[model samples]
Target: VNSFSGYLKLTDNVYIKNADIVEEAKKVKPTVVVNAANVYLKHGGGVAGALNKATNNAMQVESDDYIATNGPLKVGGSCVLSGHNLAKHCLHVVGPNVNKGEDIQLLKSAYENFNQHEVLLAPLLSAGIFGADPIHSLRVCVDTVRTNVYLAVFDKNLYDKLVSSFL
Candidate 1:
């Protein structure tokens, strides 16, 4: 599938995808890369796990520090940390747990909590490990971020499906 480019009619930000989210994060060097995690910062599987591994497990350290400093995160809340091996900063948002009750509003709040300049490389929110609908979740993310959105996808099939839906 072709890459996401140009100003979109809906969100007005360029869409993009890559097989390696870490590689794409490096290329984009966004102000912050968003990681979808649970309230306890358990962050496993899908993009959250990849982010931790890609950052040399610094994200794990950051997660620990976040809890130490701020305590357990609540739903719809988020925290930002120093991106050890990737961008200058990393943003972690509390998302729902596995195929459980998916909350698009919580993900929206997470994305909305990040108000900064430059770019933000993010996954499809709860659609990944959390098992929410990709197409619908992407729409929420797009609407939340509004602009400078780099929707990073690691799986080829998922990427192709989203590309088809978008264009």
Candidate 2:
């Protein structure tokens, strides 16, 4: 096959979350790949207001359809600018929020992993994750990544953040 993308046939108009992506990956014996795109949640998410919106009166989703990757380590939140365990070695580059310098740390870690294993794939900002919009995140990431072999995957996304004026 030219590409194994879209191997899983989900509901046409239904909401597809990261868990759905993971489920599809399992179904096709493929890896679930995602990015900091609107497909998952709000980019640079973790906004308390956003969390409040997600929670209904009962404070729970109607189904086990979506995986909640948020709120500290127990839930396996991707990275609040901190990749932690969510940022695996062989898969995608899911950095964390942009504040608290977690994004730089996580991205650095991910880049190191990618460079280490020689994997060449990167995503947008932390739409794959969200948080920690620091003034120096871009500068730090770029400064460290420049002249470095791995090349900051966030080079593009970081630029976007700068333009967003969240610097």
lDDT of each: 0.70, 0.31
Candidate 2 error regions (>4 Å) = 1-90, 98-104, 117-119, 124-129, 134-137, 144-167
Please give, for residues 1-167, the per-residue lDDT of candidate 2 as tens digits: 22234222222211111223222322333222223322233323332222223333111231122325432221112322212122222132345555434534554544333333322112333432355443344334433332212112223454445545532
What lDDT tens digits, residue by residue, belong to model 1 across residues 42-149?
656677787788877778887887788888887777777887777778877776554777565676776676555356667777767687778777777766775576
RMSD to true structure for each model, in Å: 3.8, 12.7
Off by over 4 Å in 1: 1-11
User: What TM-score does each of the candidates earn?
Assistant: 0.82, 0.28
Clashes of each: 0, 16
Where does candidate 1 have its weakest 10-residue lDDT segment? 1-10
